[PDB]
Amino acid sequence: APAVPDKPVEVKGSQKTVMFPHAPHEKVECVTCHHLVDGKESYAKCGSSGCHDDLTAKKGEKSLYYVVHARGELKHTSCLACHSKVVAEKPELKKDLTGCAKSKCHP
Numbered sequence: 001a002p003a004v005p006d007k008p009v010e011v012k013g014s015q016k017t018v019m020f021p022h023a024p025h026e027k028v029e030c031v032t033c034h035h036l037v038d039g040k041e042s043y044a045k046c047g048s049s050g051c052h053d054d055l056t057a058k059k060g061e062k063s064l065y066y067v068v069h070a071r072g073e074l075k076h077t078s079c080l081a082c083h084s085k086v087v088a089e090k091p092e093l094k095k096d097l098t099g100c101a102k103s104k105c106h107p
């Protein structure tokens with residue numbers, strides 16, 4: 001596996017960029033996010049060509065927005081799906097981890 005980033009990295013949407021910090025996620029398996037594709041490890045950017053490269057649609061497996069924000073029955077864990085579970089146990093973090101504004105993702 002490539003080196004984990006040791007600084008926040010950009011996650012570019014069509015119109016917003018959110019910084020993603022690996023450090024809070026150190027106990028999360030890499031593969032939870034960097035899921036296998038065709039049975040093989042991959043660490044390419046989520047919005048890479050051939051992956052979640054629809055940066056404007058809100059739904060569909062190609063939609064970057066959907067795979068970040070869906071709280072529905074997806075095939076891998078999205079940011080908001082896991083954060084919803086975290087804030088159930090740590091409700092002081094509700095705005096920080098799930099808010100659409102003034103959150104840690106969208107300050």
Ligand code: HEC
Pocket residue numbers: 001002003004005009010011012020022025028029030031032033034043044045046047048
């Ligand atoms: C979800 C909570 C993650 C966990 C756990 C790990 N990574 Fe990650 N990584 C994640 C995102 C959302 C991004 C940004 C991707 C983008 O589309 O811009 C990254 C970035 C990386 C990179 C750079 C390449 C890339 O995919 O952009 C590397 C090399 C990387 N991450 C490695 C890595 C490893 C080795 C992890 C476990 C120790 C790991 N990440 C965990 C999301 C998440």
Ligand code: HEC
Pocket residue numbers: 033034035036037042043044045046047048050051052060061067068073074075076077078
């Ligand atoms: C191309 C090599 C990809 C990269 C890099 C990433 N994803 Fe992906 N993702 C890809 C496929 C072919 C699929 C569908 C098959 C499956 O394995 O379920 C997915 C699926 C997801 C999902 C589920 C979406 C659904 O509709 O159920 C999520 C939540 C997801 N991917 C997230 C995700 C993230 C956060 C990534 C960067 C860290 C990422 N994927 C990389 C192809 C590829």
Ligand code: HEC
Pocket residue numbers: 018019020021024025028032033068077078079080082083086090093097104105
């Ligand atoms: C569980 C499997 C997670 C997934 C998937 C993602 N995140 Fe997460 N995130 C998780 C935890 C346990 C925490 C720490 C909560 C605590 O107890 O402190 C976080 C934290 C963040 C933060 C806040 C960092 C800070 O400012 O302190 C951010 C900005 C964040 N997470 C972003 C993020 C994104 C964009 C994700 C999908 C690519 C994502 N997280 C997935 C657990 C999990």
Ligand code: HEC
Pocket residue numbers: 011012013014015016017018055056064065066068069079080083096097098099100101103104105106
């Ligand atoms: C971190 C866990 C997030 C929280 C909380 C919320 N959003 Fe988010 N959002 C996040 C990322 C990683 C990105 C960039 C990648 C992508 O394209 O999804 C975004 C981006 C947006 C955008 C812009 C989309 C674009 O194409 O530029 C919008 C409109 C947006 N996010 C809305 C939104 C809402 C409604 C939220 C509350 C439920 C919310 N976000 C929370 C990460 C995170």
